[PDB]
Scaffold this active site. Structure first.
Site, short mmCIF file in Angstrom:
data_model
loop_
_atom_site.label_atom_id
_atom_site.label_comp_id
_atom_site.label_asym_id
_atom_site.label_seq_id
_atom_site.Cartn_x
_atom_site.Cartn_y
_atom_site.Cartn_z
N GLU A 292 0.99 -1.02 0.40
CA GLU A 292 -0.34 -0.04 0.17
C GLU A 292 0.84 1.45 0.06
OE1 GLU A 292 -2.66 -0.11 -0.28
OE2 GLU A 292 -3.73 -2.02 0.24
N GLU B 71 -4.13 4.88 -1.31
CA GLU B 71 -3.15 4.06 -0.75
C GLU B 71 -2.02 5.00 0.76
OE1 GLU B 71 -3.50 1.68 -4.18
OE2 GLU B 71 -2.86 2.25 -2.26
N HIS C 229 -4.97 3.11 2.94
CA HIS C 229 -4.85 1.88 2.90
C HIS C 229 -3.31 0.87 3.91
CE1 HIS C 229 -7.25 0.99 -0.93
NE2 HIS C 229 -8.02 1.90 0.00
N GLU D 87 -3.30 -5.15 -8.54
CA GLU D 87 -4.38 -4.98 -8.14
C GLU D 87 -5.06 -5.67 -8.88
OE1 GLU D 87 -3.81 -0.44 -6.52
OE2 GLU D 87 -4.55 -1.09 -8.31
N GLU E 260 -10.80 -0.12 -4.25
CA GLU E 260 -9.53 -0.59 -6.12
C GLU E 260 -10.75 -0.58 -6.25
OE1 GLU E 260 -6.91 -1.77 -5.16
OE2 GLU E 260 -7.78 -2.15 -3.47
N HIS F 218 -8.47 2.52 -8.30
CA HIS F 218 -7.84 1.86 -8.85
C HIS F 218 -7.70 1.69 -10.28
CE1 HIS F 218 -6.80 2.28 -4.34
NE2 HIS F 218 -7.27 3.30 -5.10
FE LIG Z 1 -4.69 -0.13 -1.90
FE LIG Z 2 -4.59 -0.25 -4.99
#
Ligand SMILES: [Fe+3]
Ligand SMILES: [Fe+3]
Ligand SMILES: [Ca+2]
Ligand SMILES: [Ca+2]
Ligand SMILES: [Fe+3]
Ligand SMILES: [Fe+3]
Lengths: 388, 166, 510, 510, 388
Positions: free
Chosen positions: D97, D127, D130, D192, D226, D229
């Protein structure tokens, strides 16, 4: 110990199996909407309506009640715990009102909470950025500390006027709205004091004691009729609707709006005051939030009631006339404040114009709703007689 | 029809109430209804299950009729019967303060409620009275509240002791 | 030019001065007392800071409920008898929380000192929060639990039964109808201090024991707000101490408040705990003597002795009656199961042993009776039997205390068996104790509450239930049930078949 | 005078026009691609609205954690093996992360279109969240769990073992060191999309199966971010699809990315799930085929076909080495247990049966070996035995891939056994597969990572552990253990007594 | 089903039983404090530090790292993932930094989320209370829509200058701070647009397009030298520290603090504008917030480094000089804006009052920290040479 001593039914294997064994194969009723019997004000039932409507155990003899029978214990003499007798207004259902903002406790304290922290950050950024350097000393020491400071008593008085209503309101939805309208007023009064104490911290010699502002309120001239009207609205009115109506749909819609917006908020700029406008913006938002509830309750539910529409408007028309005079008097005395401003600060035309702004918004937002015949020129001139 | 929230008695009264279209007539009937059906001094307990609801219905009519009959000043200051609200309030309070005992007091408070409860008297004057009257009544009642034995208190109240179990 | 600000206590410093003087600056409510002008509050809060500390508590609370607890399916994995108990516990508490709002608004009007007013003000807002919390508990159990009925409409279906009437006495009318101080003693000094604060906590214990994690999450949060209310109550006494009237009246009002509350909670709370749970936590008997005698009627009450406050003169009787009250009441609660908005259950074999162990003699009296009712088929819809019938057969009439609204069967009760019947102005009145009787004899106009027999007289059972919406969504099955199993649930028609018609037991008296 | 306001979508409509052209308005990072400057992002977000939707999520999450979960003592009632597993899973994801922050920063810098830069920016913030969320998991288990060591200092103790080196390759360097686009692929298109997202959810699965309700509460919340991303990574391919350079390089970096990510997750992940848990959820072989083949290599990659994206040419090679990959690695992981920061447990009777059932032939190899080790006392400190010794005895050298850093044992492995060894300008190099070998031959300066044997060469095991704080509070007992029981824990001296010294296995070719 | 097919180890009797059996009699270590090895900056370790310090996997060769060895994969050419080579500055430990406000992700978005909600409310009440009425058409449609609007590009540019630092930062503590400083800047630009958007909803012919201000920024002469300073700080600096430093402790402390506070914040009132001031309010707080971090990193940590104090200061006094000129040049050009104001709006004595305020604070909060002897008079004089 690490696992503790108390054994819980959700996690203790032995207890959990006992519980799991007793469970039905499926829900014994597929109607899982608490409050499903409540008539929605909107498309679908809201969490606000679900958690609020009918919490008040009114019997059917109080318009809209679902229960039956007399109260179990009344006052000495016989006065019912709650009854039709505590207000002149009549309706088909006291539970019809809906706060357009759908505020129950959680959302209400959450926004105020946000505003509290934003306020804290604001002041820290204000003192650190040294913005106090721009504020005119006389506007700061006379008008803000004394006159804006005295207005805190006005807002405090309007807050207290809500006490009887918190006890007498005939429904849950009105009780909650009423309670929130009042709490917002004590909050404003407190913000006025919060600013003075903040100034006392960043300005040498600045005294935060309320002695000066309070001396202005109880014995000055600028707020004499204002204090009289407030004292009346608070302690001479025993009808919880007359109190909430007169305060919000008459006195504060006229006197309050003028003082907060047409005076302080409008003149702070001309004196490099960027502090007071901050708190006034809150009070104005609060006024706007309360107004929506006030309108729904008095115009949408009672003013437009299918059976008492004509009766209720006569009563509110009565109340508007009864309180319009003291309010005009309050404004009239307040006109004396302009003569104290440094010469060239403002003129008779601006004052008159702002008066027309406050009066015209009132006629459109409140007066007209009940067919109250208000003459805008008559009101304004009656007030202007106060300009020294 | 014998329902809780809807039945024949309530229906009959609803009809009776629609046939009132004079403030003086409607007001007199509300005062009479109250002497006949409310408080433990009611003339009869025949409407015990519906009086509360029926009374509200009658009140609704007296209020609407009073708002159309009275000018703004009288609505704020006169009773539905044309009396000066304040004079009634003061007079009653005067009587209360001169009451010799708690027994005279309760008659004055309850009597006041049966005769002037809104829409008869404007609520401002009425609740103000509730405030003063109730105060004295409690002051006289709560004084030495347990000194009188139940045997005697029953006699003082005047109940007919029908049955006991020690 | 360094980062500075103002906190709550800095503004509160001047709160007291906010109120000013004027002729009519006085209370609008009748009262024998004079709340001192300079009374002070314990907590130095302002609106903004109050909102922030409650908003924080909400986050944790709702976060738990919406996320972890929901994923864990906590709304379901709860013992059936407890799912039903929360319908009553939460909704009934909800009304107490609700009336406390109006109750504290009346105290805020009574208070003359801006700080004392502000203290009550906080409670006013707390009670709204509490009303909505209890509402959520039912909202949550309705949307996620094993049986939404009752949880989803208690606010209207609770009006069918007789236990509801008594709740309104102590948690509604008791909080707002009377001298402002008498109300404070009912709500605070006695209500919260003696019963509620300890109760809210105890419920989370019993809740936890029966797989319920929803209630502890909410109530434990409600519990964090009680410190201010305990304070408000304490200060009410302090604000009237140096007043002549306090000496002539205080103890009388406290005594009545104590008996009023005790009369209902002593039997009802004990009933909900022991008969509405699978896993027991502690025998109600000792729980009581600790709460009422030790903690409250000794510790807390004694700390207020310096102000002329004495121990309730009816405390001895309350104790004498307490022991069997809840057992006597469940008998009536179960017998009248068709009037509730919840499902009941007969003690199982394991429970009878626990009851007998903790209450010597339980089996010879209640045990045998419950055993005879199941034999008679009380759990079975097709039996055509309702415990009520057994009462008629063995001639054990049930009366409703005209004052407390608490149902009592003097001929069958192991606890108090007193019964006083009077006639007054063409009306009959039934009393179960000497304290409630004085209250009425002295304050007749305060207690004219009509009971279920008077209101339902002549009406056939199923017709009353139907009118008051005591049905499930299928429109045919009763919300109330005589057992907590998932099959063989009675329907309106199973009741119609019984052809039971209400009649006022007092009428038998000539 | 109607109440009005503006939203994120209304301010985002003009966001693209924010960037203005000029001289050196170009990326500061080397790249073979040219991201289109007219490229759009999928979500119309402005800083303040992003902050809000995230703040709301934190409320649920932290509330559940501080309130209900803590009250249920969730951090404790978790299986020991799983408690140890989360030390690795959480902290290792943490670095991924984290480096992902620098990664999207570098991508934000790469994008020329304001919208594309904006999208990456949102990931930059996610990020960071996370990183803090994963840190919170360890933080929470440290404070409330059964074994804090490791959880409480994984940021420094993780440096002792060889598994960490491999993690940095895919979750640190692979995310930031290289062509901005190659990094994107490692991070988004492959990482990811193919592994992390599916695994985040899988983790919650295996976590809940073993009593862990903590991890689900946090990871499920991570999972919600997510989709953005996924979009960023997807838009990256779009940005370059047109550029002629794309059709000449894309597929190469994508293949290198895929091989890089799968080279580690294939073994490690399967190992963490099957060996770090008591209760199983699904055989890793099955989970692998569904993810890497159907879902990603099939569905996902397919939609990128209209942009010139072809399935990894190393895909086949991957499915071949995969089958026994994770089983081969745990043998190595357990044998080297003293170098970890977590406690390992050998399979019990039930698990061996589960393993044989799902991996025919498992017992005859892995099973018999673990039993030998256990019978010899690998769990008992007084036996003086550590599995690493068994490797020497039976001459089964353990090497470290110079590229992937993944540990492998050619003479023992049931999966791949190929091994290529080279010498260059005086340095020995060991490779485990042809793809990694190419990467080194082609880009020698990219891979100069000293492996554990080279760095610890000549050192006595207990000395390496002590210098790097592989100890618990008492300063004597090792953070790492060969069993997960509360008694008979290995101490630093139990390790020193064995007096094992590190050796560089490649020198056996000298 | 009602129970769910999936069984959980916390509530499932069977699975929980197995789990409870495997548990130890107590924790296997009493040290339950994550990050217990981190050197606190304050009395006790904070959640902020525990969750942040050492997350970056740096080896000992990058001042402060705890890991060993080299990176596993580097750039084509050999460039390390993170190396001492990306910045001129040196230090004993890159993890010494500490955000005074201790903001990790949660608090950060919380405070900003509250501001977003507050912003929504404020804007609503502002229109419902018809406060827009008082604003001047010329100022609004000209100075705000064109010159304030064009400032959003200045802000957007400072934001973009952070891109590389988000990649090259050498510690978690410096990365999070940097990300947050930059993120607030993009916020400001968006708020500037949010206003132009709001006005476009309450004022008939107002166009929310960026066409006008973008042209002014790319072509106008008032921001010409500003735009150039920005383009340089953003795309001509490859040293992440030089970028963050020169952007927050030089260029934005002067030009930025002037344009925002001394121009738009100061004059807004004189045109009946209490709207823009609400947003410039957030912007000033954000500035104060970053400043505290900027001061801690470049002054307390680097400029006061126990082994590189003298070294870093030199380097910073160097960058200050390098950019102090382009900044001044940005301000001078900006002075030419005053000549566009309606005559009488403000004299020359005022701009000088504000110019000295800005320069004085920039010497009290930045230059006097590295000992960059600067002449307040000479600097202001140079800027002043930009008026009519
Ligand atoms: Fe992440
Ligand atoms: Fe991510
Ligand atoms: Ca005067
Ligand atoms: Ca008779
Ligand atoms: Fe409460
Ligand atoms: Fe309370």
């Amino acid at each position: 110990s690490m696992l503790g001593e108390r054994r819980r039914g959700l996690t203790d294997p032995e207890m959990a199996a006992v519980i799991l064994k007793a469970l039905p194969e499926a829900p014994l009723d597929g109607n899982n909407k608490m409050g499903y019997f409540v008539t929605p004000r909107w498309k679908r039932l809201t969490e606000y309506e679900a958690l609020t409507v009918y919490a008040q155990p009114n019997a059917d003899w109080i318009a809209g009640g679902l229960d039956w029978g007399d109260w179990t214990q009344k006052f000495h003499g016989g006065r019912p715990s709650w009854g039709n007798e505590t207000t002149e207004l009549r309706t088909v259902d006291w539970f019809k009102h809906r706060d357009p903002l759908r505020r129950w406790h959680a959302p209400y304290v959450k926004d105020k909470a946000e505003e509290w922290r934003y306020t804290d950050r604001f002041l820290q950024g204000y003192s650190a950025d040294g913005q106090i350097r721009a504020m005119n000393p006389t506007w700061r020491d006379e008008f803000i500390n004394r006159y804006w400071g005295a207005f805190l008593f006005n807002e405090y008085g309007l807050f207290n006027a809500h006490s009887q209503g918190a006890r007498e309101a005939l429904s849950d939805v009105t009780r909650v709205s009423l309670a929130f309208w009042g709490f917002d007023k004590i909050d404003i009064a407190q913000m006025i004091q919060l600013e003075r104490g903040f100034l006392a911290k960043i300005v040498p010699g600045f005294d935060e004691s309320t002695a000066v502002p309070k001396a202005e309120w109880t014995n000055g001239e600028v707020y004499k009729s204002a204090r009289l009207a407030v004292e009346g609205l608070w302690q001479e009115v025993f009808d919880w609707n007359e109190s909430a109506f007169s305060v919000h749909a008459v006195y504060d819609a006229l006197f309050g709006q003028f003082v907060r917006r047409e005076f302080f908020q409008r003149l702070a700029p001309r004196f490099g005051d960027n502090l007071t406008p901050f708190f006034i913006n809150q009070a104005q938002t609060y006024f706007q939030i309360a107004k929506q509830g006030v309108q729904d309750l008095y115009y949408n539910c009672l003013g437009d009631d299918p059976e008492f529409s004509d009766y209720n408007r006569t009563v509110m028309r009565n109340w508007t006339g009864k309180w319009l005079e003291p309010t005009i008097a309050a404004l009239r005395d307040f006109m004396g404040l302009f003569a104290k401003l440094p010469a060239g600060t403002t003129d008779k035309e601006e004052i008159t114009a702002s008066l027309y702004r406050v009066v015209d918004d009132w006629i459109e937002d409140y007066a007209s709703r009940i067919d109250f015949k208000a003459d805008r020129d008559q009101i304004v001139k009656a007030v202007l007689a106060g300009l020294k | 029809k014998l329902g809780i929230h809807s039945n024949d008695t309530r229906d009959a009264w609803v009809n009776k109430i629609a046939q009132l279209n004079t403030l003086e007539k409607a007001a007199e009937m509300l005062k009479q209804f109250r002497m006949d059906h409310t408080t433990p001094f009611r003339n009869s307990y025949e409407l015990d299950n519906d009086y509360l609801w029926i009374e509200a219905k009658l009140e609704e009519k007296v209020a609407v009729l009073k708002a159309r009959a009275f000018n703004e000043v009288d609505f704020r200051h006169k009773t539905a019967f044309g009396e000066d609200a304040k004079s009634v309030l003061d007079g009653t309070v005067a009587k209360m303060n001169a009451a010799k005992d708690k027994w005279e007091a309760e008659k004055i408070h309850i009597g006041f409620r049966q005769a002037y409860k809104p829409p008869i008297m404007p609520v401002n004057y009425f609740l103000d009275g509730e405030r003063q009257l109730g105060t004295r009544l409690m002051e006289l009642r709560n004084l030495n509240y347990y000194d009188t034995p139940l045997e005697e208190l029953r006699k003082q109240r005047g109940v007919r002791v029908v049955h006991l179990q020690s | 030019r360094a980062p500075t600000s103002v906190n709550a206590q800095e503004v509160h410093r001047w709160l007291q001065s906010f109120n000013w003087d004027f002729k009519n600056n006085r209370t609008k409510y009748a009262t024998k007392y004079k709340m001192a002008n300079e009374t002070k509050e314990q907590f130095k809060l302002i609106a903004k800071e109050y909102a922030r500390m409650e908003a924080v508590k909400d986050e944790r609370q709702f976060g738990s409920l919406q996320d972890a607890l929901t994923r864990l399916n906590a709304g379901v994995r709860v013992h059936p008898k407890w799912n039903e108990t929360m319908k009553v516990v939460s909704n009934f508490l909800e009304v107490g929380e609700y009336n406390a709002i109006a109750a504290t608004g009346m105290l805020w009007d009574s208070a003359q000192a801006a700080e004392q007013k502000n203290g009550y003000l906080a409670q006013v807002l707390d009670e709204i929060r509490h009303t909505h919390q209890c509402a959520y508990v039912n909202y949550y159990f309705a949307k996620n639990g094993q049986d939404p009925a009752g949880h989803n409409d208690a606010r209207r279906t609770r009006t069918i039964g007789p236990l509801w009437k008594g709740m309104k006495r102590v948690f509604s009318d008791g909080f707002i109808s009377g001298d402002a101080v008498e109300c404070s003693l009912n709500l605070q000094l006695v209500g919260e201090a003696c019963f509620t604060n300890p109760l809210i906590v105890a419920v989370t214990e019993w809740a936890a024991a029966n797989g319920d994690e929803i209630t502890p999450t909410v109530f434990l949060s409600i519990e964090t707000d009680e410190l201010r209310h305990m304070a408000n109550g304490y200060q009410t006494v302090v604000s009237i101490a140096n007043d002549p009237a306090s000496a002539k009246y205080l103890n009388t009002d406290l005594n009545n408040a104590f008996w009023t509350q005790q009369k209902y909670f002593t039997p009802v709370l004990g009933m909900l705990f022991e008969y509405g749970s699978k896993f027991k936590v502690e025998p109600w008997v000792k729980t009581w003597d600790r709460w009422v005698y030790e903690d409250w009627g000794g510790i807390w009450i004694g700390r207020l002795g310096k102000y002329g406050v004495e121990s309730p003169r009816s405390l001895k009787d309350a104790k004498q009656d307490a022991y069997w009250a809840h057992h006597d009441l469940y008998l009536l609660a179960y017998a009248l199961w068709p009037t509730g908005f919840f499902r009941l259950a007969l003690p199982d074999q394991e429970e009878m042993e626990w009851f007998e162990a903790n209450y010597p003699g339980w089996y010879d009296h209640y045990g045998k009776i419950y055993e005879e009712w199941r034999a008679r088929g009380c759990e079975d819809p097709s039996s055509g039997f309702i415990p009520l019938m057994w009462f008629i057969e063995n001639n054990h009439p049930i009366y409703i205390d005209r004052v407390s609204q608490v149902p009592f069967c003097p001929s069958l009760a192991k606890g108090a068996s007193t019964l006083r019947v009077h006639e007054y102005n063409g009306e009959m009145h039934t009393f179960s104790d000497q304290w409630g009787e004085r209250m009425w004899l002295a304050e007749p106009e305060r207690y004219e509450c009509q009971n279920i027999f008077e209101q339902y007289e002549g009406r056939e059972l199923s017709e009353v239930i139907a009118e008051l919406h005591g049905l499930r969504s299928d429109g045919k099955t009763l919300i109330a049930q005589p057992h907590v199993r998932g099959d063989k649930l009675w329907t309106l028609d199973d009741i119609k078949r019984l052809n039971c018609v209400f009649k006022n037991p007092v009428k038998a008296f000539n």
